[PDB]
Symmetry: C3
Subunit: 261 residues, 3 copies
């Protein structure tokens, strides 16, 4: 019964929710412009690959956040028995609707952007194709099983089982970042910048499953609006500032990563 328009209007009229969404559409757009400008002098094909992969992060982000803001990738789901958000109401259109406003579109943002973050980092670290393939495939599995968890309403236990599977995939990604590429970067001559970006990425990425657990999808100590801002704040650092820092290094060290595709 809930229409896209009703959800679009619910987001508007809800200061927290509206701001957490529209601020990122704005920051993503500005980031694209800034990043394109910064990388204008790049000529080496390998350097340009790192640049495009990084720039695709805010491109995916602006489109995906528009998906949420428009109401296209938002749904109202009723949580299963025992879920801390069970029996919640939302007030849409004009009546009280059972369920929780679920911004599942965020998982699309993650599924399409995290592979680009990983591609950029792997290339920076001088990774071989095997580790890149492993990091990217498990990263995608992580995001998709996370979406499945959020979309599951049949059983409370099932939701957390998906969450556990997602975490396991996340561990694969963390192992590659912390152990494999950490060492590869030394041979690539990007040890300093990779270690910094590696640590920044690990710290911020760890925040997502924590927010999931604490937010409306998990134990719900954080209401819908606050869960959204938690994710948007993480996104601002894990995507935009992260990309700005990587591009800052790249544009001053093209020769170091020049090599060959």
């Amino acid at each position: 019964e809930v229409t896209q328009r009703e959800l679009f209007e619910f987001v508007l009229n809800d200061p927290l929710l509206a701001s957490s969404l529209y601020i990122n559409i704005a920051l993503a757009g500005l980031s694209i412009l800034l990043f394109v400008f910064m990388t204008r002098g790049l000529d080496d094909p390998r350097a340009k690959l790192i640049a495009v992969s990084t720039i695709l992060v805010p491109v995916v982000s602006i489109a995906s956040y528009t998906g949420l803001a428009s109401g296209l990738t938002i749904s109202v789901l009723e949580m299963p028995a025992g879920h801390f958000a069970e029996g919640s109401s939302v007030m849409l259109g004009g009546e009280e609707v059972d369920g929780v406003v679920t911004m599942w579109g965020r998982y699309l943002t993650w599924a399409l952007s995290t592979p680009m973050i990983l591609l950029a980092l792997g290339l920076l670290a001088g990774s071989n194709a095997t580790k890149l393939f492993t990091a990217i495939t498990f990263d995608i599995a992580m995001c998709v099983t996370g979406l499945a968890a959020a979309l599951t309403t049949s059983s409370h236990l099932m939701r957390w089982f998906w969450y556990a599977i997602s975490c396991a995939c996340f561990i694969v990604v963390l192992y590659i970042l912390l152990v494999e590429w950490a060492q590869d970067a030394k041979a690539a001559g990007t040890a300093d910048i990779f270690s910094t970006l590696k640590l920044l990425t690990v710290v911020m990425w760890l925040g997502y499953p924590i927010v999931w657990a604490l937010g409306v999808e998990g134990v719900a100590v954080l209401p819908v609006g606050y869960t959204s801002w938690a994710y948007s704040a993480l996104d601002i650092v894990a995507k935009y500032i992260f990309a700005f820092l990587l591009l800052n290094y790249l544009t001053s060290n093209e020769g170091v990563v020049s090599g060959s595709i």
Copy 2:
């Protein structure tokens, strides 16, 4: 709740709609047969890569069009206030239903076929991996944001914002075709044939956002039936004749494109 059968029946009984879909299903099938025949002499792995990528175009087209013809990838959507198609109704089953018959399945056709056209062109021009990656990623973003625009019913302005984002992605693809690959093709020794396929692709591709703006998705000067035929006509040229021209060149110049 409109059924898949009701939309399938709607396509039928509606001349322009039925013809625009089934004629492309038929042409796609015939194209695949012809292309397979045309390329049985190929032996070079690189020449064969270009050939398979090209043949995948009509393969995606026949499956995707069947998705539309069957009603599977069609939905009825109610446009937002201010949209020229808002207030429209359609006869489905035994009742009048509010909304517009939306052939969103066409976006699946484009999202799966355009990357193959780009891959064939890039390989032909001797493009490096970075440019191929750039062209294909932005091409997919263009098709997906285009689909998002067609699926947005909450706000008229939002629909056009998606449209703008999609256009920006399109500009990236255009730049690579017109500037980068045009130059790369000279080193690959395929400057002439690339020039022909490039001109064809750029002109035809530019037609899609125009049809979008004029059709039911946009200001609706073109009814659902004319919108479909407009897109179908473009597909015939951008897909089938494009593929023929490329394959006709490939089968006579296998030596030129042969490589790593």
Copy 3:
């Protein structure tokens, strides 16, 4: 009206259906741990690429089967006129509901796992990029048109048309497996292991379109519960035992697949 919980409960409380799903979740899970353990000694990057691609098979399987078991990837569809399952009922929850419980989630299991099976096999056979690309693309087309067939309710004949398209794509994959990779494997020095894996794959894969035609999706001689177990039994072989065999060889011939 049918909720996710109702389909979730339908699977549970139905010994046949529940066993066919939850058993594969367990086998997939145990397989991942077993394979990771078995390959812990690999050092060569090419060998590791084959191992990870193979390991992703049970990874996709455990996630996909959970999608089915949870009810997330299951729907209730009413078959079209003429379909042998037309006018069927099921009793979702405690009410008699028209249609057939359709576990379309299986197609996601296939579309995501088969490419990994093919990439592993192709690499083992020392396939060039062209054949890998050809096999994988037509394999995905096969899975997606198969899904389209299962999801089509507008026409009985349309379902079989999709089926035909999917079969045509399957033939392409079979040709690469049986003719081309069989030859490549010789030059790669993996002829004997490939022969074993090739036979197992061709035989098991042939079973799916057979189960489709015989099950509720096709002529419906096999009820929903038996159709599920038929696919599950095939999965156990085409995925888990196939993976064990490939990995057992891989870890014993790391040097051969490395090259230099």
